Amino acid sequence: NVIQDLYLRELKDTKLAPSTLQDAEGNVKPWNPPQKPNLPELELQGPEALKAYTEQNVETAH
C-alpha cells in the first residue's frame, strides 16, 4: 500500500546521480613503476686489495 507507493516512487523517479571514474582517481593511490633494477657493482676486484691487506695488517695469529 504505502509500501507500494514508496517502492514505485523510489525506483522510478530518481536513480543514481553522476559520478566519474576520473574523479575517483584523485582519492586513490595510483600505480607507479618500481624504478631501478638496482644493480650492485663489483667491489675489491684485483689483487690491489690483496697486496694492500697482506701489507697493511701484519698482526699475527696468537
Closest separation in Å from C-beta 7 to another protein: 9
**9-38 binders of another protein (CB under 8 A):** 10
Distance CA 26, CA 41 (A): 39
52 is a contact residue toward another protein (CB under 8 A): no
Task: Give the interface size with another protein as a residue count (CB under 8 A).
Answer: 5
Residue 10 or 25 with smaller CB distance to another protein: 10
